[PDB]
Amino acid sequence: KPSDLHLQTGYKVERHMCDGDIVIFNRQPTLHKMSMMGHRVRILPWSTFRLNLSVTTPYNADFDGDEMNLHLPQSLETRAEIQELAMVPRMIVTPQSNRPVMGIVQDTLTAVRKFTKRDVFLERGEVMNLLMFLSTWDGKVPQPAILKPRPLWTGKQIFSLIIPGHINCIRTHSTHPDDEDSGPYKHISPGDTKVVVENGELIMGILCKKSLGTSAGSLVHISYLEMGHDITRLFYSNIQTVINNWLLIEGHTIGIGDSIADSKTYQDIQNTIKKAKQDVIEVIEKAHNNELEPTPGNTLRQTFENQVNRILNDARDKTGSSAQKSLSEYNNFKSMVVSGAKGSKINISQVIAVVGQQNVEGKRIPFGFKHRTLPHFIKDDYGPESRGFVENSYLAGLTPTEFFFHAMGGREGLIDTAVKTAETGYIQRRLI
Amino acid sequence: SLKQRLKGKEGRVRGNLMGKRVDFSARTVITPDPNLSIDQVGVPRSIA
Amino acid sequence: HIDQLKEREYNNYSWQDLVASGVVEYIDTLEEETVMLAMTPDDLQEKEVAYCSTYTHCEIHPSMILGVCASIIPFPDHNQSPRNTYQSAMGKQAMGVYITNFHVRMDTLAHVLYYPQKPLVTTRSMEYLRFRELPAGINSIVAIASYTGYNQEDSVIMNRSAVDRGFFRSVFYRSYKEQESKKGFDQEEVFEKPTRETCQGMRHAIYDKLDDDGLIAPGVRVSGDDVIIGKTVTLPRYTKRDCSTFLRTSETGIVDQVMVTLNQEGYKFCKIRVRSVRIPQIGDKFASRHGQKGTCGIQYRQEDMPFTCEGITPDIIINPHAIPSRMTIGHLIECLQGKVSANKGEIGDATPFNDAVNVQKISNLLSDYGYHLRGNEVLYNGFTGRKITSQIFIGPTYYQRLKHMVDDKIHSRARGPIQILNRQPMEGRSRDGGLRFGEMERDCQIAHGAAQFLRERLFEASDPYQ
Amino acid sequence: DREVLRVIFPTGDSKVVLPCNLLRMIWNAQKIFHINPRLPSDLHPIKVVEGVKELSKKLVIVNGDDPLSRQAQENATLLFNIHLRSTLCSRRMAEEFRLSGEAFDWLLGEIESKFNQAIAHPGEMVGALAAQSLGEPATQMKNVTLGVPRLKELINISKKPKTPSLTVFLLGQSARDAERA
Amino acid sequence: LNGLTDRDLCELNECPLDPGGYFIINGSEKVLIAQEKMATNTVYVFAKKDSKYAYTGEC
Amino acid sequence: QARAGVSQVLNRLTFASTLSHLRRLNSPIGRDGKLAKPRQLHNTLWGMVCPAETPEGHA
Amino acid sequence: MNAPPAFESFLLFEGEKKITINKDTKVPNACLFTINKEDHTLGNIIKSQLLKDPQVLFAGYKVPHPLEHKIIIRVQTTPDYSPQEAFTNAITDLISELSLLEERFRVAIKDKQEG
Amino acid sequence: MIYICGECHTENEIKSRDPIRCRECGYRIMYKKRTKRLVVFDAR
Amino acid sequence: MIIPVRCFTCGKIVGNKWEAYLGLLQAEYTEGDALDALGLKRYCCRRMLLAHVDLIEKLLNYAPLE
Amino acid sequence: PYANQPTVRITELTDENVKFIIENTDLAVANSIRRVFIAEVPIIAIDWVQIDANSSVLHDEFIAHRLGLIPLTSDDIVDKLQYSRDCTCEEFCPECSVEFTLDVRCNEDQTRHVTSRDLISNSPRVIPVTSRQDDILIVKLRKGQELRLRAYAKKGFGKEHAKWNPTAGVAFEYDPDNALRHTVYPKPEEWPKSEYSELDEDESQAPYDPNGKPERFYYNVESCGSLRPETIVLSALSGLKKKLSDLQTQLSHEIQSD
Amino acid sequence: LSEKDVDPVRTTSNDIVEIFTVLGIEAVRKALERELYHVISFDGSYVN
Amino acid sequence: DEITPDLWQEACWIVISSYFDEKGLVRQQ
Amino acid sequence: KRITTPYMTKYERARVLGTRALQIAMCAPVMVELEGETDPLLIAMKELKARKIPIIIRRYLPDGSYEDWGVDELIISD
RNA sequence: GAGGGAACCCACU
Ligand SMILES: [Mg+2]
Ligand SMILES: [Zn+2]
Ligand SMILES: [Zn+2]
Ligand SMILES: [Zn+2]
């Protein structure tokens, strides 16, 4: 009835949660204090909790089915406590490791590695489209790095517009040569691998996880230390929006052609595998004819195991080095690795060249039968194939014994996760 | 017994005083949104 | 023996005749530790150093070491092993057609895909799992690309125009059982259409959709606050009180079937199947057959999705970063083989240990059909029409719609039911319960220093008392 | 200060953890005040000496004028004052950093404000912060045991460690040849 | 349903692809999960650790 | 004082789940055990037990 | 459950203005045109047509959120010209373009059908 | 009301408290009629 | 279960082609030639008919309740 | 006035597709024309289903969805048909909708293929496309199974639902020899040539054109049958022009209001 | 430590209890810090 | 006569098909 | 005689802003001039920036004593 | 304008 719809001063109206409301947002397990952060509510027309991507790192969250919790503060004191204490920009830098917890992740990261390369030139329409997504832009289009024959801006100019204030930061790209700083081209980088930002302008260098990630001294860390939490929040948002809209033009993929190597590279990998298997057979013959000298502090079987594992690790390392050396600049595995977004050189090595030795409890594949790993081998076979060295790549496909030994290896990691969660949680509870 | 009521992580103290069910809480699946700022969460209209 | 087995239903030659012939024999684990197995007959027909000249047995096929759920994985030897484990987990959560007689059955939870397809890239072991007859999934044009940033961190972009055409549309069936019970001489539950001035303690809902037998009829739309079975129990002016069966909250749908029968002890027993159509949504879980789980992050229409020069838009766009740390190369090979299979008009073979199938052979077969040999295509931006500078890996890949919809998980509570003993909020979305602000959350809010928020959560949003 | 440093850090590891990034703020002053490093500066070295003296006076962790308070304040800011006098040396400020007078005054003000922003706030629940800061990396974790079992053997004071061991160091010529070792 | 053809199973509203192998208890389909155990009548000799026994044979 | 979960409600979400649940083996070692050896993929599981199909988590 | 109606991508509700013009105070002669219930179609053609006008110093559009149906077109012109005038002239040029294309497509269809 | 017998496909009138048995073939499993209420489907 | 009316990717009509495709396969065509005779050029339309499982035929083997 | 002067070259005109070339226009204009092809060309499709009897093995929403995906002939009638949101009727009328009825009972031992031929319209200008190829299979019935339904088809475009998308495949291309380097091939020799390529077999890619812009655009608009493909293109140009005219009217009103 | 030509300054154990019983409470505080730092920084991880 | 390696894949999947035609998949239960 | 820090801590800032916002929401007199905004948090923060919040923070020492600091007496550095 | 608990199992992050 309308007589019950009258409002007096001092009444409370339990109104619906609306845009701009402050909430606490949480993902279990709540391990550190940045797994519960304050967020501003924006209503969006579907049934999920939409989350910013940089925020997925302090929550240890992804979107493979994660469910998260949202607590609404009910009073003005709790709302102001969350607003002045627990907001995401205030939680950018942690006291745990005096470094940021959230950085630039995966597509913003891959395309900021691709965007700040030297040969990236944007036309007038592309620059205007990118500046549409710069929320801190002052409205002045910068003078292009190239005026003739055609006006072209570089990606470093646009990211200089993204970089806030007058940040001064020196970093290195992940592919920076070790001998470059001692050479004649230290301050003029031939590979654009020394990042220098001066007066908030990206003067040189390709940005990556070492510059835009969650490391100490990184660009977002300097932005937090010099400009505070709000300007750094705008920095994160502007990096994500501008880079994600340039990636519509540029694009990034992964294909089966990124898993292929050259024929010369395949020949080199097969030669390295053949030579290492011959070396393992030679060590086996030395141990069998009692010509193997034990090393100090170890017995004969463990010195044999150390020698065999040294040979096979050298094989895996050399085949992997040949695999990365085969990779072109257009390779997308290499793009995601040198951007620091996803994967490692070990992953490229396993996809392209050699999966490697399978290990259970830190040793090779045990003799679960009578002196045999599988009934397809002879007894007392200590060679690489018998004891779990996978000489194939993921592109080539595994042999059935290699498939079973790889399953034995991966079951170890699954077990380690499942049985380490409880002891780690008990340790956290006792520490608290 | 009363001791079983009080003890354990499901007991009175750990399961009802150190931690407890709360009102004004919501839970659902998370999806990405590159168009939200880092201090901003997209919320369904039914939850709100 | 092979010639006799080619006419199994003519010669009456069977597997048991092959056992009786002394050709195959059953070896257990203790005997297998004394046998000498050739992996293939190529180990037998080997030259001067065969690595063994005393083989006693031969594997029939090595890919038979997998189970039911691992035998649907295409190219399992091109994947990391935990990803094969994750697919073996998620193939049991994939919605297809679980059984043929699902219309007869009233299961409590049932899930039926509209258009389940057999995979374009199958294994031969799948011929005996009846996956060709009861498949769980759809071959989807999947482009592995970073598009608008909405597929990041294990997410997919779906084609809204595809979804409008029935792509991965499913049906949820829920059955509700109720029965009259004579729990004592005076107590008599009965299926009646209740009356407001006669029944005690109704739940303020509508009862007009019930027929006068107390049961709702098939074909009637129902919502979360609706009565589907009207059962009244006699109270020993309100001679009877309401114990009607209610529909589960926020589960809108249509009554598919109502069945009335007698139980073991001869009382009336009603089972009601309610049908709800689940259109794919943001937050619904989808998985390929390689451990590539992920929720739908956004849905774009056909004019917004990137397109090839033939006008093909992907049905699903997945992030490239889902691949490198996972090393699910069998996903890429399945996509390439599916492009070849759909162009050639054949079902690609992805039996694990098969030397007849190679990435180079599939690449040459794909290049024979006017496509780039590595499966890349020149895609154009849907929004602007400009060519994407990179060339996008795109082709048919078998995807599965997992049981985990967001609408079965979304839950909010403002205030509501509380437990009797501790007077705290209830358990789960099914009881309109609250979320647990556990001990770890308490520690986190201690470390934040937010003492008033800690007091709000642990005192006056849970159980104030004086 | 150098002798005190070599007592404190006997391994020669110069990487320390300190509140105010002095080199970055000197670079900030250079960029803000348009410092030309190829021109002579107008900054007197005695201005550097006296400014660092007053700045170190006004960077207070332990309040009080009693000798116990003065000793505690000197101890609490010993590393930062050593690094401040090392970085804002008058020789380095004249020939390496080349800062002007106004740039140096802004540098002193910025160092003071950044140090006062770094002091721990009363009310900080640093025990819960420490317990979460040593348990969160635990989620991501000679036959010497390491990792979670060693962390358990540490925080639970175990009378029976899994791999107990010594690291025995030798004196004189005994450490230099393998036969007497 | 033993010995019935697929047409007879469809006339009984049963799925011919349904494997069987389960029970119907109060209308609910129940499967018996196979249970691993140590083999009987076999001598197994182990080495008990941190105990008074150096070795132990078990049958 | 009796073993539980020997009889389970048969999974009927997919035909593959039905087949997998009908061919399911169980080690009756408690899932609170933090030793790895019964959970390890033994060499003797070749051709007998699927090396890929195991649950995630405590089991 | 939270699914929006499919007509909400292109239908203005009651009280919803189609296009709103706001002066951009950062730089002179700049305006933001918020067009409701439109998408990349009109935004892209209008932005590219404004890029052809030599008196336009800036032209861009954005969809602020793909789950909402809203275009923001920022137009900056020379001081002797107006962003509203530029936007109107861009729409007029696009309309004349499409009229000419329509009649030439009709002529080409007639020519192809007659032989 | 009218219930279809599960086996014999025939419609049968059943009152309240009447045991659910088909008068033709004695089958105990019977199903309700599809409703006469008017239900609209969008063709989407 | 039944052939979709539209191709999911592009929306070409494939619902009028399943019986024609089965008749072509019965007429000793290969699957690729049968798909080519029906005008399914794009592989998105070819996966509609190539991968279709017509479960409605086996559903029609059950006696109807209604 | 800085309008383009685009030219049209039809290269193929069948009853299913139109292949044509647009020269001397911008890439945004071409892409917007393609987007209006897919999304904003109105046709008539079934949007309202009332099922009276459904004894089939397929449930009612399934049948309704399949009926909605059936294309209906919309040539010259969708132009004069009103949107139901813009119509003065209460629920439905011939000025904004077309009534369809289906009444199929299977009484024979042969499986009855209920197809789009069984959709009986009250308007002869709006019929199923396959009822002017086989007919689109709606459902299959066995003996004793029945399907009676009444449907209403209304105007709409593909931005709302993909059942109103009139095109099967809009093939769109520009710069087939990659002179503009809008895509960058890691190995240009690995890439098959376009249908519209003007290169020799020894050459894999055109020389770079720094002064070039996207100026020539190739279309293959394939129709699903609701409209003729040339009617799709003409209606798309008309719809884009009408969107621009309505936006200009609202813009002029907004300018005069301030 | 008592042995000849063994450094009585730098020689240390990894046993916390015997370091406490031999060298005292501040020494076992430093040993505890060193061993915790070793456990943390084995992975290259840094905690303040 | 011995099965040639070019016929071996077809032969081994024939004998596997025979095994699953007889035993099925739930033969142990 | 006051030994505690002259800076307002983050917890002091949070609680003073929340308490002043609740008082303004309970119709306390606004100590500053407000330019037509409604939210009590915004009024509380512009009162804190103007250093006109009429609240005294009582800081307790571990010995049991306390120091009373005006909000206008502390330095709002964060 | 809201009347059970318990046990077990499966699953999810
Ligand atoms: Mg996750
Ligand atoms: Zn009967
Ligand atoms: Zn298609
Ligand atoms: Zn009308």
Q: Which ligand is nearest to the CA of A63?
A: 1
Neighbours of ion ligand 2 (CB under 5 A): H 5, 8, 22, 24-25, 27
Report the alpha-carbon distance of residue B31 to residue C154 in Å, rounded.
Answer: 9
Q: What is the H25 CA–ligand 2 centroid distance (Å)?
A: 4
CA angle A379, A382, A383 (to 5 degrees): 115
Q: Give DSSP secondary structure letters for A268-333.
A: HHHHHHHHHHHHHHHHHHHHHTT-PPPPTTS-HHHHHHHHHHHHHHHHHHHHHHHHHHH--TT-HH
Q: Give DSSP secondary structure letters for C252-267.
A: -EEEEEEEEEE-TTS-
Report the alpha-carbon distance of residue A88 to residue B38 in Å, rounded.
Answer: 7
CB within 7 A of nucleic chain N: A 28, 62, 64-67; C 89-90, 92-93, 201-205, 225, 293, 404, 416-417, 419-420, 426; F 4-5, 8-9, 11, 26, 55-57, 59
Q: Which amino acid, one-letter code, is at J36?
A: V
Report the alpha-carbon distance of residue D75 to residue C208 in Å, rounded.
Answer: 83
Nearest to J69 by CA among C463, I7, G1: I7
- Report the run of H or E that residue A212 belongs to, with start and end: helix A209-212
Give the HSE-up count for residue C344: Cα atoms under 13 Å, Cβ half-sphere.
Answer: 18
CATH of the domain at J106: 2.170.120.12
Report the alpha-carbon distance of residue L24 to residue L2 in Å, rounded.
Answer: 28
- Residue span of the structural domain in which J8 resides: 1-42+163-258
Show the tokens assigned to F43.
């060499």
3-state secondary structure of D48: helix
For chain B, first and last CA: distance in Å? 42
Q: Which of A42, A65, A241 sits opposite B43 (nearest CB)?
A: A42
CA distances from D141 to A419, C296, D154 (A): 12, 32, 15
Nearest to G51 by CA among A146, A129, J5: A129
Q: What distance in Å separates residue E16's CA from the closest CA in chain F? A: 12
CA distances from J23 to G92, I51, J174, J238, J250 (A): 20, 40, 10, 19, 31
- Reply yes or no on domain M1-78 having CATH 3.90.1150.10: no
Report the alpha-carbon distance of residue A423 to residue A313 in Å, rounded.
Answer: 32
- Report the run of H or E that residue J149 belongs to, with start and end: strand J146-156
Contact by Cβ (8 Å): I40, I17: yes
3-state secondary structure of A241: helix
For chain D, first and last CA: distance in Å? 37
- Where are the domains positioned within chain M? 1-78
Contact by Cβ (8 Å): D86, D22: no
- Report the run of H or E that residue J219 belongs to, with start and end: strand J216-223
C293-300 and C240-242 strand pairing:
unpaired
Contacts of B14-19 with CB under 8 Å at 24 or more apart are: B14/C439, B16/C422, B16/C424, B17/C458, B18/C439, B18/C442, B19/C436, B19/C437, B19/C438, B19/C439, B19/C440, B19/C441, B19/C442, B19/C458
Those residues with Cβ within 8 angstroms of residue C359's Cβ, 6 or more apart along the chain or in another chain:
A256, A259, A260, A395, A396, C333, C336
- Report the run of H or E that residue J11 belongs to, with start and end: strand J7-13
Residues of K with CB under 8 A from a CB of D: 5-7, 9-17, 32, 35-36, 38-40, 42-43, 45, 47-48
Contact by Cβ (8 Å): J141, J160: no
For chain H, first and last CA: distance in Å? 34
Q: Are residues J122 and J209 in the same domain?
A: no
- CA torsion through residues C104, C105, C106, C110, sign: negative
Q: What is the A63 CA–ligand 1 centroid distance (Å)?
A: 6
Report the alpha-carbon distance of residue C81 to residue C78 in Å, rounded.
Answer: 9
Radius of gyration of chain I (CA): 13
Q: Which of F18, F50, F55 sits opposite C67 (nearest CB)?
A: F50
- Residue span of the structural domain in which I62 resides: 1-66
For residue A151, count other CB atoms closer than 10 A to its CB: 15
Biggest CA pair distance of chain D:
68
Residues in chain F: 59
Contact by Cβ (8 Å): B40, A52: yes
- Residues A325, A326, A327, A328: what is their CA dihedral angle, to the nearest 10 degrees? 110
Report the alpha-carbon distance of residue C445 to residue A24 in Å, rounded.
Answer: 10
- Give me the helix-helix angle, A400-431 and C81-90, nearest 10°: 80
Q: Which amino acid, one-letter code, is at G107?
A: V
Residue closest to N1, CA→C1'? C204
CATH class of G1-115: alpha beta
- I36-65 residues touching J, CB cutoff 8 A: 42, 56-57, 59-60, 62-65
Report the alpha-carbon distance of residue D148 to residue B15 in Å, rounded.
Answer: 27
Report the alpha-carbon distance of residue A348 to residue A254 in Å, rounded.
Answer: 12
Contact by Cβ (8 Å): J226, J129: yes
Contact by Cβ (8 Å): C91, C137: no
Where do breaks (C to N over 2.5 Å) occur in chain B, by preceding residue number?
none
Q: What is the DSSP letter of C216?
A: B
Q: Is A261 on the interface with C (CB under 8 A)?
A: no
Those residues with Cβ within 8 angstroms of residue A330's Cβ, 6 or more apart along the chain or in another chain:
J184, J186
Contact by Cβ (8 Å): A26, A71: yes
- Report the run of H or E that residue G49 belongs to, with start and end: helix G40-51
Interchain CB distance below 8 Å, I43 and C342: yes
Q: What is the DSSP letter of E13?
A: T
Contact by Cβ (8 Å): A53, A240: yes
Interchain CB distance below 8 Å, C128 and L13: no
Q: Which of M17, M19, M40 sits opposite A84 (nearest CB)?
A: M17
User: Cis omega before residue A149 (within 30°)?
Assistant: yes
Those residues with Cβ within 8 angstroms of residue C158's Cβ, 6 or more apart along the chain or in another chain:
C167, C168, C280, C286, C296, C298, C299, C300, C315, C316
Report the alpha-carbon distance of residue G108 to residue J13 in Å, rounded.
Answer: 10
CA angle D57, D61, D66 (to 5 degrees): 75
CA distances from C162 to A379, C305, J219 (A): 57, 11, 22
Interchain CB distance below 8 Å, D166 and K13: yes
3-state secondary structure of J9: strand
- Give me the helix-helix angle, A155-162 and A124-132, nearest 10°: 20
Contact by Cβ (8 Å): C358, I62: no
Q: What is the DSSP letter of A49?
A: E
Report the alpha-carbon distance of residue A194 to residue A173 in Å, rounded.
Answer: 6
Report the alpha-carbon distance of residue D181 to residue M51 in Å, rounded.
Answer: 72
Query: Å from C78 (CA) to N13 (C1')?
Result: 26
Q: Are residues J88 and J99 in the same domain?
A: yes
Show the tokens assigned to C190.
């009965």
Report the alpha-carbon distance of residue A130 to residue A41 in Å, rounded.
Answer: 26
Q: Are residues J38 and J50 in the same domain?
A: no
3-state secondary structure of H7: coil
Report the alpha-carbon distance of residue E9 to residue J253 in Å, rounded.
Answer: 72
| Residue A356, beta-bridge partner list | A390
Q: Where are the beta strands (DSSP E) in B1-48?
A: 20-22, 25-32, 40-43
Radius of gyration of chain J (CA): 23
C316-318 and C293-300 strand pairing:
unpaired
Interchain CB distance below 8 Å, C300 and G66: yes
3-state secondary structure of A72: coil
Q: What is the H7 CA–ligand 2 centroid distance (Å)?
A: 5
Tokens 């279960």 found at = I1
- Give me the helix-helix angle, C439-448 and D126-139, nearest 10°: 130
3-state secondary structure of C466: coil
Report the alpha-carbon distance of residue C107 to residue F10 in Å, rounded.
Answer: 11
Those residues with Cβ within 8 angstroms of residue A245's Cβ, 6 or more apart along the chain or in another chain:
A129, A130, A132, A133
Give the HSE-up count for residue A431: Cα atoms under 13 Å, Cβ half-sphere.
Answer: 25
3-state secondary structure of I2: coil
CA angle C459, C463, C466 (to 5 degrees): 85
Helices (H) and strands (E) in chain A, counts: 11, 11
CA distances from D1 to A411, D23, D97, F13, H29 (A): 55, 19, 21, 74, 96
Nearest to I50 by CA among A304, G107, C118, C227: C118
Chain L residue nearest residue C356, CA to CA: L9
Tokens 């397929």 found at = J58
Q: Is C432 a catalytic residue?
A: no
Residues in chain L: 29
CA angle A24, A28, A31 (to 5 degrees): 90
- Where are the domains positioned within chain H? 1-44
Experimental method: cryo-EM
Report the alpha-carbon distance of residue C105 to residue E48 in Å, rounded.
Answer: 54
At the fourth CATH level, the homologous superfamily of domain H1-44 is RNA polymerase ii, chain L (2.20.28.30)
Contact by Cβ (8 Å): A256, C332: yes
Show the tokens assigned to D97.
């950093």
| Residue C325, beta-bridge partner list | none
Report the alpha-carbon distance of residue A51 to residue B33 in Å, rounded.
Answer: 5
Report the alpha-carbon distance of residue A395 to residue C336 in Å, rounded.
Answer: 12
User: Cis omega before residue A29 (within 30°)?
Assistant: yes
Q: What is the DSSP letter of M64?
A: S
Give the HSE-up count for residue A112: Cα atoms under 13 Å, Cβ half-sphere.
Answer: 34
| Neighbour-count burial for C106-117, b at 16+ CB within 10 Å, e otherwise | bbeebbbbbbbb
Those residues with Cβ within 8 angstroms of residue A358's Cβ, 6 or more apart along the chain or in another chain:
A364, A365, A388, A389, A390, A402, A405, A406, A408, A409
Q: What is the DSSP letter of C91?
A: T
Report the alpha-carbon distance of residue A308 to residue A75 in Å, rounded.
Answer: 67
Contact by Cβ (8 Å): A335, A114: yes
**Domain edge (last residue) among J124, J141, J162:** J162
E28-32 and E23-25 strand pairing:
antiparallel
Contact by Cβ (8 Å): C241, C232: yes
Report the alpha-carbon distance of residue A100 to residue A90 in Å, rounded.
Answer: 11
Report the alpha-carbon distance of residue C313 to residue C294 in Å, rounded.
Answer: 20
Show the tokens assigned to C376.
């890349």
Q: Is G40 on the interface with J (CB under 8 A)?
A: yes
For residue A215, count other CB atoms closer than 10 A to its CB: 19
Report the alpha-carbon distance of residue A64 to residue C86 in Å, rounded.
Answer: 12
Nearest to J175 by CA among J157, J191, J197, J153: J197
Report the alpha-carbon distance of residue G98 to residue J55 in Å, rounded.
Answer: 51
CA distances from B13 to B7, B9, C418, L10 (A): 7, 8, 18, 67
Contact by Cβ (8 Å): A260, C374: yes
Show the tokens assigned to J135.
């007919």
Q: Which residues of H are annotated as a binding site for Zn(2+)?
A: 5, 8, 22, 24-25, 27
Query: Which among C43, C154, C164, C349 is annotated as catalytic?
Result: C154
Q: What distance in Å separates residue C341's CA from the closest CA in chain I? A: 9
Those residues with Cβ within 8 angstroms of residue J258's Cβ, 6 or more apart along the chain or in another chain:
G21
Show the tokens assigned to C348.
């690609």
Q: Is F23 on the interface with L (CB under 8 A)?
A: yes
Count of the separate structural domains present in chain J: 2
Residues in chain G: 115
